[PDB]
Amino acid sequence: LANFLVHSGNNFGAILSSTNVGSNTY
Amino acid sequence: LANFLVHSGNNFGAILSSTNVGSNTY
Amino acid sequence: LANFLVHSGNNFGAILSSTNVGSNTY
Amino acid sequence: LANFLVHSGNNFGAILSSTNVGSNTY
Amino acid sequence: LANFLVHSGNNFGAILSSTNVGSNTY
Amino acid sequence: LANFLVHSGNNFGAILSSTNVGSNTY
Amino acid sequence: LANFLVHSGNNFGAILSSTNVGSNTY
Amino acid sequence: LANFLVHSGNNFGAILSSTNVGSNTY
Amino acid sequence: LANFLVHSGNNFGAILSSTNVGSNTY
Amino acid sequence: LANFLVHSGNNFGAILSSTNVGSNTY
């Protein structure tokens, strides 16, 4: 069906794919 | 069907794809 | 059908694609 | 059918594509 | 069905895939 | 000032109050 | 100031209050 | 200032309050 | 300042308060 | 400042407070 499959009744969480997240604190 | 598949009844979470997120704190 | 597929009954979450998000705090 | 597909019954969330979002706080 | 499958009743946790997360503290 | 207060610079998200949302799929 | 306060620069997410959301799948 | 306070630069997530969410799958 | 305080640069996660979430699978 | 304080640069996780979550599987 798919390479990735998320099946839920209620969903509240984030879903990231091919993302670049970065944090810099000075 | 797809490379990525999200199937839910109620959805409340963010869905990111090929995104660049960045935070800088000074 | 698609490379990405979001199937829901009620949707409330944001859907980002190829987006650049940035925050700077001084 | 498409590269990205969003199928819902009721939709309330934002859908961004190729967008640049930025916030600066002084 | 899929290479990865997440089946739940209520979901609250993040789901990352092919993501690069980084933090730098100075 | 108020029981609920939403203060933003740019707003794009829906704001619901005392609403009844329902979806039925057959 | 308020019982609930949401202060942001850019807002894209939904804000629900005293809402009843329901989904039925057959 | 408030009983609940959400302060961000960019916001993308849903904010629920006194909400009743329900899903039924047959 | 508040009883609950969420301070972030970029926010993507849901924020629930006094909510009742329920899922029934048959 | 607060009874509970969440301070982050980028946030992706759900934040629950005074919530009742329930799942029933038959």
Numbering used by the authors:
A (entry chain H), B (entry chain F), C (entry chain D), D (entry chain B), E (entry chain J), F (entry chain A), ...: 12 to 37
Sentences from the paper on this structure:
Human islet amyloid polypeptide (IAPP) is a 37-residue polypeptide hormone that is co-secreted with insulin from pancreatic β cells and plays an essential role in glycemic regulation. IAPP forms amyloid deposits in the pancreas of >90% of individuals with T2D.43–45 A single genetic mutation resulting in a serine to glycine substitution at residue 20 (IAPP-S20G) is associated with familial, early-onset T2D.46,47 Recently, cryo-EM structures of IAPP amyloid fibrils assembled in vitro for the wild-type (WT)48–50 sequence and IAPP-S20G48 have been determined, as well as those of patient-seeded WT IAPP. Here, we used cryo-EM to determine structures of amyloid fibrils at different times during in vitro fibrillation of a disease-related variant of human islet amyloid polypeptide (IAPP-S20G). Strikingly, the fibrils formed in the lag, growth, and plateau phases have different structures, with new forms appearing and others disappearing as fibrillation proceeds.
Based on these data, we selected three distinct time points to solve the fibril structures present to high resolution using cryo-EM: 3 weeks, representing the late lag phase, 6 weeks, representing the growth phase, and 22 weeks, representing the plateau phase. 2D classification of fibril segments from the cryo-EM images revealed that ~30% of the fibrils in the 3-week dataset display an ~21-nm crossover distance, which was not a major component in the 6- or 22-week datasets, consistent with the analysis of nsEM images. A single solvable fibril form representing ca. one third of all fibrillar IAPP-S20G imaged was present at 3 weeks. These fibrils yielded a 3.0 Å resolution cryo-EM map that contains a 2PF fibril core with a 21 nm crossover distance, into which an atomic model could be built for residues 12–37 of each subunit. Despite these differences, the 3-week IAPP-S20G and WT IAPP fibrils share some similarities: they have a similar crossover length (21 vs. 25 nm), have a conserved inter-subunit interface involving the major aggregation prone region of IAPP (residues 23–27), and share a similar backbone conformation across residues 15–28. The remaining 68% of fibrils at the 3-week time point have no discernible twist, and their structure(s) could not be solved by helical reconstruction. The balance of sub-unit folds underlying the different fibril structures also changes as assembly progresses, with the P-fold found in the earliest fibrils in the lag phase, followed by the L- and C-subunit types in the 6-week sample, with the L- and U-subunit folds dominating at 22-week time point.
